[PDB]
């Protein structure tokens, strides 16, 4: 048995569970909802789409919403992404 402490340089992204819950919430709005970082934009209403964006916990990203209920969509999803409750 051999072991080695290594630095992960591979790309990371939202895990499946967190992404699924994100999508479940986003789907309740008619607005298009996207997550964006460094010129890359993914659809927040799709699990695989959300997971394709390279992100790390603690990373800053841009949440975008466009539609009739964009304000509420933004408020609810921003709270979710930042794990805020009450």
- DSSP letters spanning 29-47: SSSEEEEEETTEEEETT-H
Quick one: tokens of 50?
């959300």
Contact flag: residue 74 with a second copy (CB under 8 A): yes
Residue window 19-58: x/- pattern of binding to a second copy, with contact defined by CB under 8 A: x--x-------------------------x--xx-xxxxx
**77, 44 contact by CB (below 8 A):** yes
Quick one: tokens of 71?
């304000």
Taking the complex as a whole, how short is the minimal distance between the CB of residue 80 and a second copy, in angstroms?
Answer: 8
Which parts of this chain interact with a second copy (CB under 8 A)? 1-19, 22, 48, 51-52, 54-66, 70-71, 74, 78, 80-84
């Amino acid at each position: 048995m051999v072991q080695q402490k290594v630095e992960v340089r591979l790309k990371t992204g939202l895990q499946a569970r967190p992404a699924a819950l994100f999508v479940q919430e986003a789907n309740r709005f008619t607005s298009d909802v996207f997550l964006e970082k460094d010129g890359k934009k993914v659809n927040a209403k799709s699990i695989m789409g959300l997971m394709s964006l390279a992100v790390s916990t603690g990373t800053e990203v841009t949440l975008i919403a466009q539609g009739e209920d964009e304000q509420e969509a933004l408020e609810k999803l921003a709270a979710y992404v930042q794990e805020e409750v009450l």
